[PDB]
């Protein structure tokens, strides 16, 4: 959920999702993100997914 932000015809359900992903209390996000443990080499490299 939250990923189906604007893909459901369920008009009511579409509401709360936007409200919760607006109040700055939560932030959804997928993909290659920033990390502390970064560039630390052992064989290749550490990335955070």
């Amino acid at each position: 959920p939250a990923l189906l932000r604007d893909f459901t015809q369920v008009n009511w359900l579409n509401r709360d999702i936007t409200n919760m992903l607006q109040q700055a209390g939560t932030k959804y996000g997928l993909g290659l993100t920033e990390t502390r443990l970064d560039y630390v080499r052992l064989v290749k490299t550490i990335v955070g997914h």
Binding site: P1, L3, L4, R5, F7, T8, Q9, L30
Partner: protein, 49 residues
């Protein structure tokens, strides 16, 4: 070398999702989006039909 833990392509997870559909509630608006608009938010739409 000892080889303790083995590696995998994609992680599994312990907690998954289930659903019980009602085969008589279909919307008459076949919506559409782009292909990259599809892929990222794709299989998640077909778990919340």
């Amino acid at each position: 070398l000892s080889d303790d833990f083995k590696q995998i392509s994609d992680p599994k997870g312990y907690l998954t999702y289930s659903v019980k559909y009602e085969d008589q509630f279909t919307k008459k608006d076949k919506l559409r989006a782009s292909e990259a608009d599809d892929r990222i938010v794709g299989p998640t739409v077909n778990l919340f039909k």
